[PDB]
Design a binder for this molecule. Structure first.
Ligand SMILES: NC(=O)c1ccc[n+]([C@@H]2C[C@H](COP(=O)(O)OP(=O)(O)OC[C@H]3O[C@@H](n4cnc5c(N)ncnc54)[C@H](O)[C@@H]3O)[C@@H](O)[C@H]2O)c1
Ligand SMILES: NC(=O)c1cccc([C@@H]2O[C@H](COP(=O)(O)OP(=O)(O)OC[C@H]3O[C@@H](n4cnc5c(N)ncnc54)[C@H](O)[C@@H]3O)[C@@H](O)[C@H]2O)c1
Length: 238
């Protein structure tokens, strides 16, 4: 293998021959320098947006990968120009990442149940790491998860406070935002490349009439997502 050690570790973690398996991911994975601006930013995101409700554990960033799905960049060219694009968390079971890296983040299939969703079958994201982290489904005896940072082309958000079974966005709208009671401090946002990064500490959003504790973001076209980073997270349960 001609791949940095942290990558090879990742490959096995996902599958369960390495070089053959990297070709199957159809993804260009690179290790982000620990002392770089990217890493300093990404770790600052992970620190500040770890939520008080999620006292079950601390997070430590083991490795940061700069993923670049083959063909995804071109697919996202339409929405690349769209305004208000954010870098957001998406957590999933480690078993899935084989598909997620090869096929990209997809919508929950037709066969799946629709009743379970707050804002319908779409691709959900969070601006709070601890929210997404919970979907890694890490446990005491398996405390290493994988978590995505997607560039999400949100555009004009349909900002809802309450469960809405959506099958069509209002005209002008390209995304839904569930308004949480607690939000990454908006005055402490920073812009990495062209993308907004809501990495401020959690403060009260000022929204009183909402059922959510934290924000969440939904998009109903797979093309609106561009996967940027892939973090290897150590869950330190209390
Ligand atoms: N993720 C789920 O589908 C789900 C379902 C049931 C309970 N819970 C628990 C409730 C609690 C929420 O924590 P956290 O995610 O940090 O808080 P949060 O308030 O930021 O998010 C609440 C979560 O529940 C979902 N949700 C809220 N209201 C509805 C609704 N009316 N219909 C369908 N889905 C809805 C919402 O989409 C989001 O994922 C945790 O203990 C969760 O594990 C989660
Ligand atoms: N997932 C979160 O980080 C998250 C963020 C904010 C809020 C929430 C809250 O959880 C609710 C559900 O969220 P969930 O993302 O699990 O969506 P759901 O549709 O039920 O689950 C499908 C799973 O399939 C994964 N996957 C994506 N691409 C592929 C692929 N090519 N091959 C295989 N698997 C793939 C995907 O990551 C997800 O785990 C949602 O309604 C909401 O209340 C989650």
């Amino acid at each position: 293998s001609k791949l940095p050690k942290p990558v090879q570790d990742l490959i096995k973690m996902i599958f369960g021959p390495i070089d053959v398996n990297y070709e199957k991911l159809k993804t260009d994975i690179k290790v982000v320098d620990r002392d770089s601006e990217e890493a300093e930013i990404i770790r600052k995101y992970v620190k500040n947006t770890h939520a008080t409700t999620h006292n079950a554990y601390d997070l430590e960033v083991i490795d940061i990968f700069k993923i670049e799905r083959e063909g995804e960049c071109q697919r996202y060219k339409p929405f690349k120009q769209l305004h208000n694009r954010r870098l957001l968390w998406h957590g999933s079971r480690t078993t899935n990442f084989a598909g997620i890296l090869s096929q990209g983040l997809r919508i929950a299939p037709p066969e799946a149940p629709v009743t379970g969703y707050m804002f319908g079958k779409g691709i959900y994201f969070a601006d709070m790491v601890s929210k997404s982290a919970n979907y890694c489904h890490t446990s005491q005896g398996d405390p290493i998860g994988l978590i995505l940072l997607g560039e999400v082309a949100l555009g004009n958000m349909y900002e809802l406070k309450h469960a809405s079974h959506i099958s069509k966005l209002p005209k002008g709208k390209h995304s839904v935002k569930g308004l949480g009671k607690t939000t990454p401090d908006p005055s402490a946002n920073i812009s990495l490349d062209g993308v907004d990064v809501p990495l401020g500490t959690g403060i009260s959003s000022g929204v009183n009439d909402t059922s959510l504790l934290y924000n969440e973001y939904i998009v109903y076209d797979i093309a609106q997502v561009n996967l940027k980073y892939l973090l290897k997270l150590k869950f330190n349960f209390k």
